[PDB]
Design a protein around this nucleic acid. Structure first.
Ligand SMILES: Nc1ncnc2c1ncn2[C@H]1C[C@H](O)[C@@H](COP(=O)(O)OP(=O)(O)OP(=O)(O)O)O1
Ligand SMILES: [Mg+2]
Ligand SMILES: [Mg+2]
Lengths: 538, 321
DNA sequence: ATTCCCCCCCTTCGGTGCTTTGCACCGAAGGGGGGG
């Protein structure tokens, strides 16, 4: 019946009181579903028919489960959640199949009516009061109060997850060799026993849970592969994601494209070389989620490339603890990176991608370091270990970058792999002034009121130039002055600025940015052979 | 002893960062041992306060230790060689109304099970009230060769000759040396400087106004010290401790000891431990650190090399020095 | 049409700090995907 587990004490925030919301009208079949589910839970003792006193109320409604024939009963507890104390969540993440070890015996179980089995604290039951309306809005409704955890309340998930852990602790204490993965009420049970010998211990768990009021119907007890677990398709030796359907829609809207980006961003964990930047760029500026977005030729190609990747089958493999993890990162263009994790070559544990542009000005080295850090954190999350990286950056290039950078940076144990796109610094500012080369003393000073600057350069050998700038700022004008100095110099220049800002933008050695002026300065810096840059106080 | 929060201040709600299989296994072994002797106890989700926890392997001991990041909680509570004292802090009980804030959550590899939450039943290790309720100890660290601590003076290079760059830089190591070292108001160098020519008495009068050290710059026990670290390249680290900008209480240099020419984070982490230990014995407060490192880079690796029971507050710089 | 909770990404906007009142960076809140 109901779990004999001890109830978690719940309180409202101090000063606050219970809800007094009303009930919204409902469809005539939702009313029937709500009252039948409700006659059932009242017979089973899950709700206590209230009546002429409760000064509390909360709207209720129903949706359809994945079963497509049953209904889920929900309560819109938003106001109560506002007025309810705060809980600390214990679910710190989602388990991944790539972190699962190959187990000879595997079974997946599901606790029926998971929430309606854990009791609710007695003092808090009044606040959960609700009213089931009247068939064809006619008579007064049959009101109830929740004796168990409701679906819609914000303290229900944490309480249920703690209760399930407390229930499963006795079983795991006497049975160490079975791995148990508990996600809410979904249980993955793995063992190093044969079929006829771990069923005996699965029917023992099914009765240990049943002793605590937790039932387990045998229609959601999966005993044979492939197991449908956490949105995957677990095979005895491999695993894969459940089939992913991509839209084939003639006209695309904003939401119609964010769905596409979300699908590809989830398929990118196993499928290799998935890119969304050209499609995710179509979701800029536009805010109304109903307008037909035309598909650019760059996004059309990405859609074309993505759909043939999703045309062939991909399957990962399981973790082997007696091996080392290898991550192979690849640069794929426009700041997008792809990585693969494996222990044996050509058999991937999981695929991924990185296309986050963190900062205003950055280069390939910093982006690669960011990707390495992300992969390291993710691997520590999944396997508890730091992998070995196959980076496309030379050892000498990384040594040059890290030995001449103010910010402290590191990459764990790694090795270089010869792939066509390599990570390199496209230019390097030199330390000592160059003989034979002229100087390009730059100043662009603006006016903060009329937005008028004077961007120019003066040469030691008698050469000056000045270009008036409008609608610009102090920093933009001096960047334009540096650009002007680079524009009319030979294949060697000595640039001396008055700007501690423009030095920072250039000394960091970027290669791409959203600012057009910085991109033009970078482009011109690549052409020049040797460049010196220093700042002086005016 | 009744301890309470700062009026208007609630309690820590910090998330738990991921750990490695070896740290989790050590933490489970340690917490199970402590729970069986009553020092900690299991709690549920009804407690909304959380502090991060992690494990460190102590120097030349091969024995793991538990460390709780009691930084948010300490800033909200209303209250020479070094060795350990936290152990003894396990012998005085806490206050039942305060035990709710000292709660942590041990994570699980691959998110196998929901995190196991605990809370302290005795005085924790890393909590400023801890030394209190209970020769100089910081808070749990009970206090190397403190016989040579000084303030590095700034010096313009000595050799010969003068480039329109060496002078164009000189007025830079100088005009900047102003709010810091006054007296160098030298202004005549703008004659072989601003003039436009190829970059390819006052000197010693200021080489003397630099000889004199961190004049004045006295310490007040009201503003917590700020420490900013600079990477000088090839395992060379320099730091400055200033209460108010442009007047340094102490500056120094940290050369290459650990992580030989391979690991910046190992060098930075040990430098922070070195400066903090320096501050405690002379000032008594852990300075706020402005670290020349990214956010993700420091948070991922600083626990791998940390060897100190205390954890100072720090911020990360984002602009060149 | 109506709920909660967790993880991820991608975009947008407000707060913060230094500075040259712009500019750069970060955190939180929308949209989406997945999960129970
Ligand atoms: N859409 C949802 N809204 C709120 N809570 C939900 C939702 N889906 C699942 N949950 C929570 C409450 C459920 O008791 C718990 C476990 O999910 P699930 O097993 O699908 O439901 P259940 O146990 O109520 O039904 P079933 O009898 O089909 O197992 O997760
Ligand atoms: Mg299910
Ligand atoms: Mg179920």
């Amino acid at each position: 019946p109901i779990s004999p587990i001890e109830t978690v004490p719940v309180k409202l925030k101090p000063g606050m009181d219970g809800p007094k919301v009303k009930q919204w009208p409902l469809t005539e079949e939702k009313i029937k579903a709500l009252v039948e589910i409700c006659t059932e839970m009242e017979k089973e003792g899950k709700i206590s028919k209230i009546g002429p006193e409760n000064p509390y109320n909360t709207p209720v409604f129903a949706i359809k489960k994945k079963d497509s024939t049953k209904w889920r009963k929900l309560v819109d507890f938003r106001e109560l959640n506002k007025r309810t104390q705060d809980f600390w969540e214990v679910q710190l993440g989602i388990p991944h199949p790539a972190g699962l070890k190959k187990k000879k015996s595997v079974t997946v179980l599901d606790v029926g009516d998971a929430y309606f089995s854990v009791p609710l604290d007695e003092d808090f039951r009044k606040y959960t009061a609700f009213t089931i309306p009247s068939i064809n809005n006619e008579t007064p409704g049959i009101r109830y109060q929740y004796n168990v955890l409701p679906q819609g309340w914000k303290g229900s998930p944490a309480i249920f997850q703690s209760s399930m852990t407390k229930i499963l602790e006795p079983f795991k204490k006497q049975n160490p060799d079975i791995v148990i993965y508990q996600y809410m009420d979904d249980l993955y049970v793995g063992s190093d026993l044969e079929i006829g010998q771990h069923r005996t211990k699965i029917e023992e768990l099914r009765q240990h849970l049943l002793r605590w009021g937790l039932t387990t119907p045998d229609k959601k007890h999966q005993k044979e592969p492939p197991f449908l677990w956490m949105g995957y398709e677990l095979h005895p030796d491999k695993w894969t994601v459940q089939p992913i359907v991509l839209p084939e829609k003639d006209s695309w809207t904003v939401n119609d494209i964010q769905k596409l980006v979300g699908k590809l961003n989830w398929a990118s964990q196993i499928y290799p070389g998935i890119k969304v930047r050209q499609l995710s760029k179509l979701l800029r500026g536009t805010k109304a989620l109903t307008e037909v977005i035309p598909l650019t030729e760059e996004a059309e190609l990405e859609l074309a490339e993505n759909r043939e990747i999703l045309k062939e089958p991909v399957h990962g493999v399981y973790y082997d603890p007696s091996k080392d993890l290898i991550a192979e990162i690849q640069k794929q263009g426009q700041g997008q990176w792809t990585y693969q994790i494996y222990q044996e070559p050509f058999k991937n544990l999981k695929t991924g991608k990185y296309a986050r542009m963190r900062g205003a000005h950055t280069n390939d080295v910093k982006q690669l370091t960011e990707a390495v850090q992300k992969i390291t954190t993710e691997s520590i999350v999944i396997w508890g270990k730091t992998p070995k990286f196959k980076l496309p950056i030379q050892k000498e290039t990384w040594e040059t970058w890290w030995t001449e950078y103010w910010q402290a940076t590191w990459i764990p144990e790694w090795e270089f792999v010869n792939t066509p796109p390599l990570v390199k610094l496209w230019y390097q500012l030199e330390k000592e002034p160059i003989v034979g080369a002229e100087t390009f003393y730059v100043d662009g000073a603006a006016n903060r009121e009329t937005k008028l600057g004077k961007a120019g350069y003066v040469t030691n050998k008698g050469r000056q130039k000045v270009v008036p700038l409008t609608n610009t700022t102090n920093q933009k004008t001096e960047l334009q002055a540096i650009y002007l100095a680079l524009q009319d110099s030979g294949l060697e220049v000595n640039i001396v600025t008055n700007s501690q800002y423009a030095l920072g933008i250039i000394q960091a050695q970027p290669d791409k940015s959203e600012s057009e002026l910085v991109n033009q300065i970078i482009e011109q810096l690549i052409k020049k052979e040797k460049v010196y840059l220093a700042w002086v106080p005016a | 002893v009744p301890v309470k929060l700062k009026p208007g201040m609630d309690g820590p709600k910090v998330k738990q960062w991921p750990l490695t299989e070896e740290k989790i296994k050590a933490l489970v072994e340690i917490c199970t041992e402590m729970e069986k002797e009553g020092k900690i106890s299991k709690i549920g989700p009804e407690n909304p306060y959380n502090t991060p926890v992690f494990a460190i392997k102590k120097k030349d001991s091969t024995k793991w230790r538990k460390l709780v990041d009691f930084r948010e909680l300490n800033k909200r509570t209303q209250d020479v060689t070094v060795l350990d004292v936290g152990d003894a802090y396990f012998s005085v009980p806490l206050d039942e109304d305060f035990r709710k804030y000292t709660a942590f959550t041990i994570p699980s590899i691959n998110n196998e099970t929901p995190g196991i939450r605990y809370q302290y039943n005795v005085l924790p290790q890393g909590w400023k009230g801890s030394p209190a309720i209970f020769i100089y100890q910081y808070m749990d660290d009970l206090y190397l060769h403190p016989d040579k601590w000084t303030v590095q003076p700034i010096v313009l290079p000595e050799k010969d000759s003068w480039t329109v760059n060496d002078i164009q830089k000189l007025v830079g190591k100088l005009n900047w040396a102003s709010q810091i070292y006054p007296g160098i108001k030298v202004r005549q160098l703008c004659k072989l400087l601003r003039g436009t020519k190829a970059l390819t008495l006052e000197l010693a009068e200021n080489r003397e106004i630099l000889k004199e050290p961190v004049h004045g710059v006295y310490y007040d026990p009201s503003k917590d010290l700020i420490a900013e670290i600079q990477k000088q390249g090839q395992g060379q680290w320099t730091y400055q401790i200033y209460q108010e900008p442009f007047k340094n209480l102490k500056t120094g240099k940290y050369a290459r000891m650990r992580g030989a020419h391979t690991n910046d984070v190992k060098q930075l982490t040990e430098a922070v431990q070195k400066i903090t230990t320096e501050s405690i014995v002379i000032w008594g407060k852990t300075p706020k650190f402005k670290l020349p490192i990214q956010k993700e880079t420091w948070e991922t690796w600083w626990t791998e090399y940390w060897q100190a029971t205390w954890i100072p507050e720090w911020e990360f710089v984002n602009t060149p020095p």
